[model samples]
Target chain A: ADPLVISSGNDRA
Target chain B: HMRALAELLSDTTERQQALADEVGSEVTGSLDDLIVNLVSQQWRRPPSARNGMSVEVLIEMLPDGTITNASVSRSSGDKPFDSSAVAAVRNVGRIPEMQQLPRATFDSLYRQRRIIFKPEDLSL
Candidate 1:
């Protein structure tokens, strides 16, 4: 969850 | 790496689903196998009563199926039971990485990564 968003460095929320 | 993780609710055990979908294959296999072996071997003794004991595990998943962090939460509320639970968890050297969702974040579900293994009546 956090990893994907964090690593991807995109707050694609 | 200790203290409160959740608030409110029923089920004194504090059992809740961290993820809605099925667990990753590797995560499932590793956790399931570790739990299976521990329950089968450790719970066999008389001192270790069933139902009275519970174990909660939190595994941090990396995007590459690597376990960035493995944490134990909440004690079952007994010395022997606690020790036994810790020992069993410690016995499993490395957590098996999950295959499916390699990027899921893993965090503590509840406080006290403890395991309960004694009769509740005796504690009181």
Candidate 2:
């Protein structure tokens, strides 16, 4: 992943 | 005047590029990586069935990490997906680490960086 960050799966706020 | 002298002496004016090398760079996980982490925190996967769709965005920022633009460079062909990705970036507004980078690195890597927004669950 050169610069890709997958959204945190549990990231629901 | 001691007050005036204190003020002048307090301004070290010692921050320089070469002098701030490894230690400075090591202070964080590279500016680019920090940027992704910052954006990801605000990224939202709009509930949709386009989970397979990934939108590639071109994000432009100022030296202060303020987002200048978030447009789709490579659209997912799905309007909702693309817009969500764009909005996700705009929502982040700014990434303070931008100030940590050298102009060379910023211009070369992050001035107008390409980021792909891929979601596992979409159109849900």
Best-performing candidate as measured by TM-score: 2
Q: Model 1 scores what on Cα lDDT?
A: 0.33
If you assessed candidate 1 against the hidden native complex, which CAPRI class would it receive? incorrect
Q: What is the DockQ of candidate 1?
A: 0.02
Candidate 2 lDDT, B3-57, residue by residue in tens: 1112223444552323321223333335554555555566666566255667778
Misplaced by over 4 Å in model 2 are: A1-13, B1-29, B49-51, B121-124
DockQ of each: 0.02, 0.20
Q: Write the per-residue lDDT of candidate 1 for residues B12-64, one digit (tens) a residue.
A: 46557354323344333333333323322433222443444554434333433
| Residue B111, candidate 2: C-alpha displacement in angstroms | 0.7
lDDT of each: 0.33, 0.60
Q: TM-scores for chain A, candidates in order?
A: 0.15, 0.21
